Amino acid sequence: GQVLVVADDFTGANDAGVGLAQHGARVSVVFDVNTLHADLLGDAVVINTDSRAARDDVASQRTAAAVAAWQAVGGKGWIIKKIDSTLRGNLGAEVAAALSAADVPVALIAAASPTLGRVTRQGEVWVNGRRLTDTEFASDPKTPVTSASIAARLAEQTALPVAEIHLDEVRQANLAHRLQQLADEGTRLIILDTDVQDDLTHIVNAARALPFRPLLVGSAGLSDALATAQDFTRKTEKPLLAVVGSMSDIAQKQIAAARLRSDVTLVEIDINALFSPDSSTVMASQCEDALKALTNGHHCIIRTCQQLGETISHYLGELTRSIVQALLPGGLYLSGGDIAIAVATALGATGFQIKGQIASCVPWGYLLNSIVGMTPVMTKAGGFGNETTLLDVLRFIEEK
Ligand SMILES: O=C([O-])[C@@H](O)[C@H](O)CO
């Protein structure tokens, strides 16, 4: 389930890394292949061969050495040779080297990044409406681009047999069978069209259906599709604890948006149960549920489903206090205002030091003199925000 990215430059390495991290990977750029070891392998390793303007033989040697070093410490999973979307550099030498080191029958070259305006049509790269050779990316200063044809570029440095699969054929349900056919026939480099990001999803699904893991070759688009397909477990060390008593439509939508995530757990508070005699045992249960979510790296959303409001706010205050004593969390989000005040009071707070605001409607700071110490606390009034407000709060806590 491990990924190796071998990129030919600084920005390519970073861009691949970012994409992996965004999809839940533990990912690092390792500066010298000589500091690679088994513990660094989970989930992704990125090597920058800094070889775009190097001699072809040097580029080849570095690329192969990166793959070999990863293999030598037990790397197993997927290898992506990150190339320039605009086809600058030692493409053929580096792809051939990576394929040799990978020791599998084929490389899938799916170079497009449609969300960045790079597509592959009939084997040629187009950038924002022009063939690549009618763009700037092709006028030196260091590394000319003499063809928009991926095959033609490759052939400057490698004579490995190639085949192109154009868009209509790419989109067929039998793509994996076609990849297998070409492999069996001795084709080594398979060059695939792409117009939209879904095409890259489809190509990676086909790659995953083969009895070996092909070498992958592409730019940000393919890297993102690979990262997505790995389905990395989303977790955070210090997750948000959210406590929401708001029954507004927008609160439901905000929670629903977070609920879509695999790293979010809801603890639902049946208002009816508050009047039952076993209320305390149920609260103990809800406390346990929240602890289990938070300690296993899920954000935890506690939400309900005159004096009624006060009964509910008091209960949520006591549940929150119970969870804090039982413990984390990375942050505390309280909504609406009645909940914010009831919870603050239950935690012994004397005030709220305001540092700023998230998403134009979520004040944040620290409670003063409370049992949550310097845990960031966020509040939101009932009715405020948009469908992504709570997602914005999750991101805030993830980043700090
Ligand atoms: O693929 C791209 O366009 C970028 O990663 C570029 O190669 C960075 O120099």
Centroid of ligand 1 to alpha carbon of 87 (angstroms): 9
Point out the ligand 1 atom lying closest to the alpha carbon of residue 9: 9
Experimental method: X-ray
- Residue with the smallest CA separation from ligand 1 atom 5 is 12
Of ligand 1's atoms, which has the minimum distance to the CA of residue 85?
Answer: 1
188 CA distance to ligand 1 centroid (A)? 24
47 among annotated binding-site residues: no
Handedness of CA 293, 295, 299, 303 (dihedral sign): positive
Say how many C-beta atoms besides its own lie within 10 A of residue 387's C-beta: 11
> Which residue, among 16, 213, 9, 195, has the nearest Cα to 118 in the 3D structure?
195
Q: Is 123 assigned to a binding site?
A: no
Which phi and psi (to 5°) does residue 155 adopt?
-65, -15
Residue nearest to ligand 1 atom 7, measured at CA? 84
Report the amino acid identity of residue 263: D
User: Which residues form the pocket of ligand 1, taking CB atoms under 6 Å from any ligand atom?
Assistant: 9, 11-12, 15, 84-86, 219-220
Using most ligand atoms within 8 A of CB, pick from 15, 81, 115 the residue to mutate for ligand 1.
15
Whole-angstrom distance, CA of residue 339 vs CA of residue 397: 20
Nearest atom of ligand 1 to the alpha carbon of 86: 3
Pairing of strands 331-335, 376-380: parallel
Q: Which residue, among 357, 287, 298, has the nearest Cα to 324 in the 3D structure?
A: 287
| Most ligand 1 atoms within 8 A of CB, residue of 219, 222, 224 to mutate | 219
Nearby residues of 305 by Cβ (< 8 Å), 6 or more positions away:
268, 269, 270, 271
**238 in a labelled binding site:** no
> Is the separation of the CB atoms in 266 and 294 below 8 Å?
no
326's CB contacts (< 8 A; 6+ apart) are 287, 291
Q: How far apart are CA 340 and CA 325, in angstroms?
A: 18
Domain borders along the chain are 1-235, 236-400
Nearest to 16 by CA among 5, 31, 30: 5
CA distances from 95 to 91, 160, 220, 249, 327 (A): 6, 10, 16, 53, 51
Rg (CA), the chain: 26
70 vs 201: CA distance, rounded Å: 26
From residue 35, give the alpha-carbon distance in Å to each of 45, 72, 97, 109.
Answer: 11, 12, 21, 29
Instruction: Name the resolution in angstroms.
Output: 1.5
Q: In sequence order, what are the residues at sequence separation of 6 or more whose Cβ sits closer than 8 angstroms to the Cβ of residue 311?
A: 274
Report the interhelical angle of 220-230 vs 10-22 (nearest 10°).
30
Residue 291 CA to residue 239 CA, distance in Å, equals 11
Q: Read off the tokens for 242.
A: 């959210």
Rounded to whole angstroms, the Cα distance separating 340 from 381 reads 9
